[PDB]
Design a protein around this nucleic acid. Structure first.
Ligand SMILES: Nc1ccn([C@@H]2O[C@H](COP(=O)(O)OP(=O)(O)OP(=O)(O)O)[C@@H](O)[C@H]2O)c(=O)n1
Ligand SMILES: [Mg+2]
Ligand SMILES: [Mg+2]
Ligand SMILES: [Zn+2]
Length: 463
RNA sequence: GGUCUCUCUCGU
RNA sequence: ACGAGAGAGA
């Protein structure tokens, strides 16, 4: 992904889009009970913690583009993946605006506690002014779309969140693209049934884990990924996608049976326009993370990428013995023989991809179930029932969340949520966690889940 | 101050 | 089941 041009809003006639500059993350009453090295991300250009030009760091993720048209390996990869999806029988028909706005049993409705994007953001109008859950009316929406049309520019914000201090110093905060409600509901109408199918079949057939529950999915992963494992993260995944991969995505969508009208929207994703403060800018390539179906499309492109790198990098690869699941750019995959991920990365850099170990560490090493991670969680077999697998969130990542808050009114909700992650690390680590919470006044006022009840509730999930 | 998924909590 | 809120993950 590379920025093509940057004109002021005056020259493009776009309305300015004003974004918050102050973090909502105050330190919590547990801020000094637990060690930790994450701080709220840099959001103002004058953040004293900066050591690099701010706006230059945010946009440094647009590495640039390499390929524009698919080669032989990427075509073969795309078709292999697409024939895999055929067995799901995606209904490619247009979804109706009622279900697209208000949801179905396998696709939650448009979030009305969040913005409506350009231009509504600047016009003061909110999503709840167009859609009501109770009537499930679409007339108010059908009207507005007719009036502003589609291909509406994305609104660029910086994300308020705890980040590494390396990334605070180097100004590498995350950019999100606020979709226009019009673009969002049109994508849902075009691809609603594919979203539905993906959410309802996490696993190695979608090659996706969107919709999975780690508490139960982890026990299946060793069965869905037999053989020797490998695993990746990508550095700057969304911006690092050259337009070739969107062409390759069109190949997949055609081959599962979408109309020439439907695949035409892919170019609207490969080629996007964004407002940030008082400027407009055009991005070619790169996924606009914040669009409808971000996770699902990131995951599908990843299935294409991995396949394409294997058959290009190694002779004698057989893509039918490959199992993988992707959640966005997180990969966990397996193959009957060991795969030298160092070579897949060399290939990726040729396509403009920066592949890294899952942990984002400096060297690749062998990956097996005892050191694997997916969605930050490890794999730890139960002591009594070794075929059940605990998703283990590391205690350090739990300690970092508990040290901050966006509203102390929710302290108990927060700690409870964290306890439900923590106890998979076992009774000793868990009770060390709970004793720490109890070592401060507010902690002794909180209801904390009892370990055995958590373990009993977990074991009941398999009945 | 986006798209999603998952889990929890509070309400007839 | 339906509404309200939270946390985590991508
Ligand atoms: N809050 C987030 C985080 C992730 N993503 C999507 O998931 C992708 C990968 O997630 P992640 O690895 O966390 O971010 P990266 O872009 O790869 O940056 P990094 O180098 O830090 O891994 C992103 O590119 C983005 O498209 C998202 O939409 N919203
Ligand atoms: Mg990444
Ligand atoms: Mg990732
Ligand atoms: Zn353009």
């Amino acid at each position: 992904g590379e920025i093509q041009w940057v004109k002021p809003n005056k020259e493009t006639g776009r309305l300015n889009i004003n974004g918050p500059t102050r973090t909502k993350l105050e330190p919590s009453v547990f801020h000094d009970v637990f060690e930790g090295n994450k701080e709220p991300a840099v959001l103002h250009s004058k953040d004293p913690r900066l050591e690099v030009d701010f706006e230059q760091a945010l946009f440094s993720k647009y590495v640039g583009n390499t390929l524009y048209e698919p080669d032989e390996y990427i075509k073969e990869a795309a078709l292999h993946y697409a024939n895999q999806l055929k067995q799901l029988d995606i209904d490619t028909s247009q979804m109706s605006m009622e279900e697209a706005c208000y949801g179905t049993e396998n696709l939650e409705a448009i979030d009305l506690h969040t913005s409506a994007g350009y231009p509504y953001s600047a016009l003061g109008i909110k999503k709840r002014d167009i859609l009501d859950s109770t009537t499930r009316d679409v007339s108010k929406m059908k009207f507005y779309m007719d009036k502003y049309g589609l291909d509406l520019p994305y609104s660029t914000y910086v994300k308020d969140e705890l980040r590494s201090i390396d990334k605070i110093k180097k100004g590498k905060s995350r950019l999100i693209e606020a979709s226009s409600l019009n673009d969002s509901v049109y994508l849902r109408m075009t691809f609603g049934h594919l979203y539905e199918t993906f959410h309802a079949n996490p696993g190695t057939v979608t090659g996706s884990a969107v919709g999975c529950n780690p508490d139960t999915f982890w026990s299946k992963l060793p069965i869905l990924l037999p053989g020797s494992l490998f695993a990746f993260d990508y550095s700057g995944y969304d911006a690092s996608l050259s337009p070739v991969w969107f062409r390759a995505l069109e190949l997949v969508l055609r081959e599962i049976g979408y109309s020439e009208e439907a695949v035409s929207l892919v170019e609207g994703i490969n080629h996007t326009h964004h407002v940030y403060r008082n400027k407009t800018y055009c991005v070619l390539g790169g996924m606009p993370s914040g669009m409808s179906g971000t996770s699902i499309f990131n995951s599908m492109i990843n299935n294409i990428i991995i396949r394409a790198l294997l058959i290009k990098t190694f002779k004698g690869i057989d893509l039918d013995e490959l199992n993988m699941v992707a959640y966005g750019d997180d990969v966990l995959a397996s193959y009957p023989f060991p795969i030298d991920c160092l070579e897949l990365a060399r290939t990726g850099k040729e396509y403009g991809l920066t592949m890294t170990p899952a942990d984002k560490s400096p060297c690749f090493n062998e990956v097996n179930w005892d050191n694997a991670t997916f969605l930050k969680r490890g794999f730890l077999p139960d002591e009594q029932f070794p075929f059940l697998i605990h998703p283990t969130m590391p205690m350090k990542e739990i300690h970092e969340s508990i040290r901050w808050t966006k509203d102390a009114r929710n302290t108990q909700d927060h700690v409870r949520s964290l306890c439900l992650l923590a106890w998979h690390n076992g009774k000793q680590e868990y009770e060390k966690f709970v004793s720490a919470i109890r070592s401060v006044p507010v902690g002794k006022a909180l209801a904390i889940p009892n370990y055995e009840n958590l373990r009993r509730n977990w074991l009941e999930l398999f009945h």
